[PDB]
Amino acid sequence: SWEVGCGAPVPLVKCDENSPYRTITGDCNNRRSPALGAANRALARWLPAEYEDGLALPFGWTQRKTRNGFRVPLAREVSNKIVGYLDEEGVLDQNRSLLFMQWGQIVDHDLDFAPETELGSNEHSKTQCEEYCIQGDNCFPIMFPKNDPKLKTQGKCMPFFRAGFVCPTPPYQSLAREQINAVTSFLDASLVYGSEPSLASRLRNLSSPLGLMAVNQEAWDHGLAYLPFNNKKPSPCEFINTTARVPCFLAGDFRASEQILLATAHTLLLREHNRLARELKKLNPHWNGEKLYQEARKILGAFIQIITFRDYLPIVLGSEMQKWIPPYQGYNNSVDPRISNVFTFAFRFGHMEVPSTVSRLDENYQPWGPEAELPLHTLFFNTWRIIKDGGIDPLVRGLLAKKSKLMNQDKMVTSELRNKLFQPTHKIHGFDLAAINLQRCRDHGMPGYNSWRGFCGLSQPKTLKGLQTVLKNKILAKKLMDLYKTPDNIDIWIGGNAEPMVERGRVGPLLACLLGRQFQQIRDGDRFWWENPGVFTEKQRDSLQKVSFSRLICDNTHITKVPLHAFQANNYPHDFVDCSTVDKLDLSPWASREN
Numbered sequence: 001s002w003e004v005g006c007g008a009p010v011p012l013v014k015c016d017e018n019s020p021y022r023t024i025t026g027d028c029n030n031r032r033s034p035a036l037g038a039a040n041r042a043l044a045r046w047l048p049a050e051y052e053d054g055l056a057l058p059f060g061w062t063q064r065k066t067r068n069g070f071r072v073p074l075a076r077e078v079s080n081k082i083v084g085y086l087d088e089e090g091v092l093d094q095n096r097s098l099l100f101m102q103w104g105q106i107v108d109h110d111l112d113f114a115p116e117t118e119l120g121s122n123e124h125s126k127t128q129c130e131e132y133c134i135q136g137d138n139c140f141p142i143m144f145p146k147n148d149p150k151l152k153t154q155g156k157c158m159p160f161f162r163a164g165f166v167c168p169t170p171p172y173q174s175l176a177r178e179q180i181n182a183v184t185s186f187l188d189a190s191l192v193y194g195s196e197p198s199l200a201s202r203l204r205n206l207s208s209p210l211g212l213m214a215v216n217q218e219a220w221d222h223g224l225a226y227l228p229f230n231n232k233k234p235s236p237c238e239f240i241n242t243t244a245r246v247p248c249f250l251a252g253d254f255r256a257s258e259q260i261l262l263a264t265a266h267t268l269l270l271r272e273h274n275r276l277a278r279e280l281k282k283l284n285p286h287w288n289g290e291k292l293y294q295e296a297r298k299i300l301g302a303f304i305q306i307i308t309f310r311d312y313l314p315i316v317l318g319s320e321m322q323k324w325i326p327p328y329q330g331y332n333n334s335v336d337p338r339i340s341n342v343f344t345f346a347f348r349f350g351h352m353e354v355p356s357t358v359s360r361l362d363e364n365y366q367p368w369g370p371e372a373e374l375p376l377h378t379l380f381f382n383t384w385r386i387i388k389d390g391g392i393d394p395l396v397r398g399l400l401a402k403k404s405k406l407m408n409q410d411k412m413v414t415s416e417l418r419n420k421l422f423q424p425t426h427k428i429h430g431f432d433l434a435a436i437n438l439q440r441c442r443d444h445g446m447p448g449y450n451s452w453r454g455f456c457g458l459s460q461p462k463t464l465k466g467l468q469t470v471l472k473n474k475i476l477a478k479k480l481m482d483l484y485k486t487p488d489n490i491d492i493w494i495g496g497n498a499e500p501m502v503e504r505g506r507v508g509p510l511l512a513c514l515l516g517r518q519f520q521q522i523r524d525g526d527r528f529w530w531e532n533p534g535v536f537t538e539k540q541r542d543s544l545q546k547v548s549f550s551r552l553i554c555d556n557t558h559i560t561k562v563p564l565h566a567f568q569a570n571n572y573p574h575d576f577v578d579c580s581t582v583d584k585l586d587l588s589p590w591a592s593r594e595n
């Protein structure tokens with residue numbers, strides 16, 4: 001009965017089966033089904049979508065329509081009563097660097113992107129939603145509850161537009177709405193190179209046969225490269241400071257400039273590609289542009305995969321790492337490599353790891369200048385602070401020496417994100433990411449908390465006392481029950497993040513299962529996984545095994561002192577060393593001798 005499937009909007013595929021390299025769109029990875037994992041196709045559904053009308057209306061759209069007999073609470077009311085807090089003191093993670101939060105953002109970006117629908121061009125459809133808060137079509141405004149401080153200073157709501165969906169942009173009516181993943185599902189550095197041919201070419205430097213990525217020609221970081229500017233107007237980065245008038249950066253991913261430390265991470269990755277390309281050129285003078293670029297791109301992809309699976313996932317999943325991601329056993333073409341719609345919400349556990357401020361530190365790892373520490377919100381879409389205020393080095397020192405925020409049942413998300421988020425085209429630092437996450441969860445037709453608990457083989461609390469035991473928190477379960485009248489209605493983003501973290505990890509049991517299962521598939525179902533026999537030669541793998549985020553910093557910045565385990569909390573100068581005692585990536589095995 002279940003159909004072969006739709007996909008009118010989706011592009012046609014032709015595959016070079018000889019190709020030793022990935023496509024930019026992800027197509028051709030799986031040979032039997034070439035479109036699996038490819039960008040711009042529907043996110044996978046691990047469970048049937050749950051919409052108010054079974055097809056496309058989110059729960060909460062029709063006021064009179066209940067979910068399981070109860071009205072769903074406003075996303076902003078759950079944010080105000082459960083997610084927010086005042087005191088930032090004592091909220092830091094004693095054993096994770098700020099780099100741990102940032103890498104999580106980088107990895108998410110590489111894997112999934114579900115952009116708001118496109119209809120606002122030559123239209124006030126976007127202007128109206130914002131200006132008048134009238135719910136309709138793609139406009140699904142986040143209404144402020146009665147006692148909300150924002151009602152007094154910001155109006156009746158926060159604009160919010162429904163995510164883009166496959167086939168008709170216009171709503172379909174026989175089968176459940178499926179949201180689109182605009183990027184490639186493989187952990188493949190698509191955030192650096194782009195997931196569309198159109199964008200991938202624009203990022204390259206084709207003026208020279210060196211396989212380099214294009215760089216900024218208007219500014220340099222003490223001779224080091226910056227990413228090219230996106231000269232698209234309007235620009236949110238110019239808008240945050242019309243006097244500095246510095247635009248956003250142009251990277252393989254559309255969100256690169258959202259916050260200063262993400263732009264910073266993208267810069268290091270870009271520098272790495274060119275550094276690898278230059279190096280390869282030396283060793284194999286005979287290799288042309290396409291060759292160099294594809295080879296450096298392939299090494300960068302492996303670097304990202306290694307740092308992620310070897311350093312990052314174990315300290316996220318703790319004790320559950322083995323359970324869900326057993327040691328590698330090779331490529332399995334039977335595995336669905338597609339990112340699931342629920343994983344795009346599970347991975348948002350990172351939102352509770354973002355601290356309230358960002359620091360710039362000098363070569364002594366001491367405050368750099370008079371305004372060295374800055375509130376996070378002044379840093380959304382902020383490029384000028386990097387270009388006109390010291391480059392990226394002082395920021396990278398902060399990523400190593402400062403701490404991530406620790407998830408806390410009583411202090412979930414910092415007000416820098418919960419009350420002062422800046423959204424492009426909107427003019428103010430007054431949005432709420434936590435509310436947007438909850439409204440989105442509904443937009444995507446997410447099944448509720450207990451459906452996912454069942455999916456992960458975990459208990460399904462039906463009462464306040466039952467929920468109290470699962471969350472090991474009486475007061476939190478009581479607020480959740482007061483808001484959602486049954487655990488069955490609790491949105492997965494908030495339910496999953498409310499659970500106490502597993503041993504040696506940073507997420508609860510439910511998230512560990514959703515995340516673990518996804519990463520296992522991402523690895524096992526990738527024909528181009530770095531450790532799959534034949535992708536790299538065995539000597540190349542011996543060389544890749546040494547990659548480290550410390551080495552990445554050393555080779556692409558002017559920082560000469562770094563920790564050996566960049567993700568753990570590290571203090572200067574004790575946990576820091578000279579870049580000379582740190583393993584280098586040895587590109588000797590890439591010397592291809594032919595004659």
Ligand code: HEM
Nearest residue numbers: 101104105108112113114259344347348350351354436440
């Ligand atoms: C200051 C740092 C961060 C900012 C400002 C931020 C901001 C945002 C915003 C504005 C959205 C779009 C929300 C929506 O429209 O539904 C989003 C989505 C998302 N965020 Fe974050 N975020 C940050 C950190 C992170 C971290 C550390 C992680 C992971 C460890 C992460 C994971 C995600 C994921 C998976 C999505 C959904 C992406 C997609 O599939 O569309 N975020 N973030």
Ligand SMILES: *[C@@H]1O[C@H](CO)[C@@H](O[C@@H]2O[C@H](CO)[C@@H](O)[C@H](O)[C@H]2NC(C)=O)[C@H](O)[C@H]1NC(C)=O
Nearest residue numbers: 204205206207208210212213214215216217228
């Ligand atoms: C594309 O690559 C060319 C060649 O590397 C770049 O041109 C040069 O700019 C460098 C700075 O990296 C100068 O030192 C040289 O005068 C030029 N070098 C050569 C070998 O000609 C060009 O800037 C690149 N274009 C973009 C947009 O990145």
Ligand SMILES: *[C@@H]1O[C@H](CO)[C@@H](O[C@@H]2O[C@H](CO)[C@@H](O)[C@H](O)[C@H]2NC(C)=O)[C@H](O)[C@H]1NC(C)=O
Nearest residue numbers: 240241242243244245246378384385387388389
């Ligand atoms: C926007 O960017 C400008 C340009 O850098 C900032 O102006 C600088 O800030 C301090 C003075 O407070 C000085 O260190 C710089 O020399 C200033 N330059 C100039 C030309 O004034 C400005 O503070 C930023 N404004 C906002 C709102 O972010």
Ligand SMILES: *[C@@H]1O[C@H](CO)[C@@H](O)[C@H](O)[C@H]1NC(C)=O
Nearest residue numbers: 329331332333334335336524
């Ligand atoms: C390959 O993947 C399929 C589908 O997920 C799975 O059932 C099977 O056990 C995997 N094969 C091996 C050898 O693990």
Ligand SMILES: *[C@@H]1O[C@H](CO)[C@@H](O)[C@H](O)[C@H]1NC(C)=O
Nearest residue numbers: 094095096315565567568569
């Ligand atoms: C600090 O973190 C690392 C993992 O990154 C771990 O090996 C070490 O035991 C941690 N220390 C404590 C006290 O948890």
Ligand SMILES: NC(=O)c1cnccn1
Nearest residue numbers: 105108109255258259262
């Ligand atoms: N961290 C994120 O996933 C993100 C960052 N900026 C915009 C949208 N999403």
Ligand SMILES: NC(=O)c1cnccn1
Nearest residue numbers: 254255256257258423424
């Ligand atoms: N924060 C964001 O959603 C974002 C990031 N980059 C470009 C546009 N929007």
Ligand SMILES: [Ca+2]
Nearest residue numbers: 110184186190
């Ligand atoms: Ca990808």
Ligand SMILES: [Zn+2]
Nearest residue numbers: 221222223558
């Ligand atoms: Zn310098």
